[PDB]
């Protein structure tokens, strides 16, 4: 084409002709500049004063191709650093994009959905500003069809991704009323069968379940948990990862919220998550298990009935370090809230030897956690007089050595608790 590899000054020259077609040629040239793999000259385009011009081409209904090329170019500028996105926002692009959502041309309205994604994705300020200019209704209106399958699927993947950026980020979280407004549509996309729509829906739901409990409540009350759990079942890691993150958020809430996930079947998928060959899934599953072990006795009991304690012993014994840390926490939590039977059982599954092994990590915080894991367990062995039998096993497998040495460690809690234990059970 005659619009390949132009110079910025050419683009300026055409954009300042007063000839709508030359403007179009030069805007298409800018767009192609801005779409190239290595290092598009975003700043020059910005310094040349192009943004107000592009922005005002958005409003030329009479001339749809220029609407589209300007949309795309502005999209790609807005895809840069914050500073580059501020330039696009500062040119007035937001209301002008919101207007293109109504375009009769699907390829143009799709480009506007996409640009607004890049803006909202910068941060909660821009996100909340896209929201204030009215974007949500017309976005939601685009999905108001009896069956999502009839929409082109590039199109649907865009809207979903955009919607999920309106759910994203955190100081502050998105406005409650915006959330209520978006949710029914999330719930529907979360049942659609495109893997990418599903990944992005789960991501939205994870962004919404990362805060305080009223926020989690809003999501739980929509009844998406069963569906999350099924997605947790999914063979595509790009779906499992966000599903697992949303499950994980949700069980940081109340016991009653945690129970919906237990009720939903979640614990049956754990054998497999806790042995997942993706390190990250294994970490997050463990993290999730640790907030389930911080619940009620009868919840700890379900972790027991599902056969998950061996999988924690497993993870304590061999996984990557950060996953072992989370496992330690699952253990300490289990040992605080557990009955005696339960804590006994945990010992019979073989928790002591791999717990001691970790005692020799250079991570000062894991050691504290392990320390009252032991402590809590000693505690329960007192209530059945078994401290002997217990002290022996700890002795038997290198426990006592590392422990005693602990005293000679720089810490307030470390040396206190180690010395304590030794003075209490090993003198």
Rounded-to-integer distance, Cα 366 and Cα 375, Å? 14
Which residue lies nearer to another protein by CB, 199 or 330?
199
Q: How far is the CB of 165 from another protein (least distance, A)?
A: 7
Query: Are 84 and 46 a contacting pair, CB within 8 Å?
Result: yes
Q: How far is the CB of 238 from another protein (least distance, A)?
A: 3
Q: How far is the CB of 168 from another protein (least distance, A)?
A: 8
Rounded-to-integer distance, Cα 330 and Cα 312, Å? 8
Residues whose CB is less than 8 angstroms from the CB of residue 237 and which lie 6 or more positions away in sequence, other chains included: 278, 281
Binding site for another protein (CB under 8 A): 32, 34-37, 40, 72, 75-76, 78-80, 85, 111, 114, 117-118, 121-122, 161, 164-165, 168, 199-200, 203, 236-242
Which residue lies nearer to another protein by CB, 169 or 357?
169
Q: For the chain, how are helix, strand and coil distributed in percent, rounded to 5?
A: 75, 0, 25
* The two three-digit tokens of residue 334, written as one number: 């289990």
Where do we find the tokens 């729509």?
A: 197
Q: How far is the CB of 159 from another protein (least distance, A)?
A: 14
Rounded-to-integer distance, Cα 124 and Cα 178, Å? 13
Q: How far is the CB of 56 from another protein (least distance, A)?
A: 21
Which residue lies nearer to another protein by CB, 85 or 376?
85
Q: How far is the CB of 75 from another protein (least distance, A)?
A: 6
Where do we find the tokens 């614990």?
A: 267
Which residue lies nearer to another protein by CB, 39 or 305?
39
Which residue lies nearer to another protein by CB, 236 or 341?
236
* The two three-digit tokens of residue 7, written as one number: 């110079």
Rounded-to-integer distance, Cα 130 and Cα 123, Å? 11
Which residue lies nearer to another protein by CB, 85 or 391?
85
Q: How far is the CB of 126 from another protein (least distance, A)?
A: 11
Which residue lies nearer to another protein by CB, 157 or 325?
157
Rounded-to-integer distance, Cα 238 and Cα 54, Å? 36
Question: Whose CA is closest to 191, among 155, 154, 152, 143?
Answer: 143
* The two three-digit tokens of residue 172, written as one number: 């502050």
């Amino acid at each position: 084409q005659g619009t390949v590899n132009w110079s910025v000054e050419d683009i300026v020259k055409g954009i300042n002709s007063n000839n709508l077609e030359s403007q179009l040629q030069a805007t298409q040239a800018a767009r192609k500049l801005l779409s190239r793999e290595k290092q598009p000259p975003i700043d020059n385009i910005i310094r040349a004063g192009l943004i107000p011009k592009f922005v005002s081409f958005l409003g030329k209904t009479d001339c749809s191709p220029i609407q589209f090329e300007s949309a795309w170019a502005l999209t790609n500028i807005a895809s840069g650093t914050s500073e580059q996105t501020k330039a696009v926002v500062d040119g007035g692009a937001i209301p002008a994009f919101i207007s293109l959502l109504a375009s009769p041309h699907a390829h143009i309205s799709e480009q506007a959905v996409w640009a607004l994604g890049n803006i909202a994705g910068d941060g909660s300020a821009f996100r909340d500003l896209v929201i204030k200019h009215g974007a949500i209704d017309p976005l939601l209106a685009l999905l108001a069809v009896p069956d999502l399958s009839t929409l082109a699927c590039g199109y649907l993947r865009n809207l979903t991704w955009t919607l999920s950026n309106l759910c994203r980020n955190k100081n502050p979280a998105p406005p409650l009323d915006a959330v209520e407004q978006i949710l029914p549509t999330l719930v529907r996309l979360l049942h659609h069968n495109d893997p990418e729509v599903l990944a992005d829906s789960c991501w939205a739901i994870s962004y919404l379940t990362d805060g305080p409990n009223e926020r989690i409540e809003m999501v739980v009350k929509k009844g998406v948990v069963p569906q999350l759990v099924k997605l947790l079942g999914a063979t595509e890691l790009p779906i499992v990862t966000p599903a697992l993150r949303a499950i994980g958020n949700i069980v940081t809430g109340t016991d009653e919220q945690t129970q919906k996930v237990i009720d939903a079947g979640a614990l049956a998928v754990f054998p497999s998550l806790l042995t997942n060959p993706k390190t990250n899934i294994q970490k997050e599953a463990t993290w999730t298990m640790s907030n389930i072990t911080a619940g009620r006795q009868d919840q700890i009991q379900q972790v027991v009935n599902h056969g998950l304690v061996p999988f924690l012993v497993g993870v304590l014994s061999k996984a990557d370090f950060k996953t072992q840390k989370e496992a330690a926490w699952a253990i300490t939590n289990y040992t605080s809230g557990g009955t005696v039977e339960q804590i006994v059982y945990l010992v019979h599954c073989g928790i002591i030897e791999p717990l001691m092994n970790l005692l020799s990590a250079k991570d000062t915080k894991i050691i504290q956690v392990i320390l009252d894991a032991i402590s809590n367990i000693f505690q329960a062995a007192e209530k059945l007089g078994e401290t002997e039998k217990l002290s022996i096993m700890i002795e038997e497998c290198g426990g006592l050595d590392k422990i005693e040495a602990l005293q000679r460690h720089e810490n307030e809690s470390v040396y206190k608790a180690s010395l304590n234990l030794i003075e209490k059970y090993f003198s």
